[PDB]
Scaffold this active site. Structure first.
Site, PDB file in Angstrom:
ATOM      1  N   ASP A  95      44.745  39.963  35.228  1.00 24.81           N
ATOM      2  CA  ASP A  95      46.163  40.310  35.211  1.00 24.81           C
ATOM      3  C   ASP A  95      46.909  39.659  36.375  1.00 24.81           C
ATOM      4  OD1 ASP A  95      45.915  41.873  32.884  1.00 24.81           O
ATOM      5  OD2 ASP A  95      45.801  43.765  33.975  1.00 24.81           O
ATOM      6  N   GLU A 115      43.763  45.957  23.349  1.00 20.88           N
ATOM      7  CA  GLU A 115      44.899  45.891  24.254  1.00 20.88           C
ATOM      8  C   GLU A 115      46.136  45.452  23.483  1.00 20.88           C
ATOM      9  OE1 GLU A 115      44.353  43.856  27.955  1.00 20.88           O
ATOM     10  OE2 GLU A 115      42.906  45.343  28.662  1.00 20.88           O
ATOM     11  N   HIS A 133      45.863  49.024  28.864  1.00 19.02           N
ATOM     12  CA  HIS A 133      44.439  49.150  29.110  1.00 19.02           C
ATOM     13  C   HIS A 133      43.899  50.297  28.275  1.00 19.02           C
ATOM     14  CE1 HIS A 133      44.793  47.206  33.369  1.00 19.02           C
ATOM     15  NE2 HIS A 133      44.892  46.329  32.386  1.00 19.02           N
ATOM     16  N   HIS A 191      51.633  45.478  28.777  1.00 21.47           N
ATOM     17  CA  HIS A 191      50.376  45.500  28.042  1.00 21.47           C
ATOM     18  C   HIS A 191      49.664  46.802  28.369  1.00 21.47           C
ATOM     19  CE1 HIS A 191      48.486  44.141  31.828  1.00 21.47           C
ATOM     20  NE2 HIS A 191      47.322  44.462  31.295  1.00 21.47           N
TER      21      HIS A 191
HETATM   22 ZN   LIG Z   1      45.484  44.387  32.187  1.00 17.56          ZN
END
Ligand SMILES: [Zn+2]
Ligand SMILES: [Cl-]
Ligand SMILES: [Zn+2]
Lengths: 126, 129
Positions: free
Chosen positions: A90, A23, A79, A77
């Site tokens: 999250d 990530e 995935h 961010h």
């Molecule tokens: Zn996430």
């Protein structure tokens, strides 16, 4: 709620994500809801299913934005594989940092979110 | 916490999940932290990416469990092609149902989760016996 981001910044994020096995994460700096600067921050968890910003790099980035009179418009961010929708962890992070959360993945999908009510933020690409 | 589940119960859940095109869901009934009975419940969303228990069946399952002196040890469900980690919707459900949440997927992976004393997601050790 809308998030205004330049096309070339979003493409740059997606390009980094397309090449990453973990990530990715960082800050969207700017003013109001407009992204003016993108700052990648190292994911200290080195993980394909979660992220945590390196705290020393996080503080350095925040200091630099303050010197430049910028604010945190959002956190971004990625995935890997799964959709750009907040995980449970999250949502916990959105409560700690209630700015716009931009989530992307390696398939080029992107969505944005903001906070006990979670609403999707419309992304306006410029 | 620790979740103790018999091996043939976990195997049954995983093999049902392997054959299913939608998320599977149900109750883990038992005593303390020990699974004693698995009860599948229809996913009224008929969805490969989320679940909600049919209320009709959910109520009947709980009264059946009561008739057998069993308590709700956990809720189990599956993800398809994503890690067995709580979604945002799952977290909402974990606050409404503060029990152990067992999550599995079609790759045979399984993890369990609870909300801590600070109401944060925390992983639960699974003991297969
Ligand atoms: Zn996430
Ligand atoms: Cl439910
Ligand atoms: Zn789930």
């Amino acid at each position: 709620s809308t998030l205004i981001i330049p096309q070339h910044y979003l493409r740059a994020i997606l390009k980094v994500v397309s090449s990453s096995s973990v990530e990715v994460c960082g800050f969207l700096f700017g003013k109001e809801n407009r992204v003016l600067k993108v700052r990648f921050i190292r994911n200290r968890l080195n993980s394909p299913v979660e992220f945590e910003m390196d705290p020393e790099e996080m503080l350095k980035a925040l200091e630099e934005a303050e010197q430049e009179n910028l604010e945190v418009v959002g956190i971004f961010h990625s995935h890997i594989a799964c959709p750009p929708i907040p995980s449970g962890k999250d949502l916990e992070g959105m409560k700690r940092w209630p700015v716009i959360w931009l989530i992307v993945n390696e398939k080029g999908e992107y969505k944005a979110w903001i906070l006990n009510k979670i609403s999707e933020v419309k992304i306006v690409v410029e």
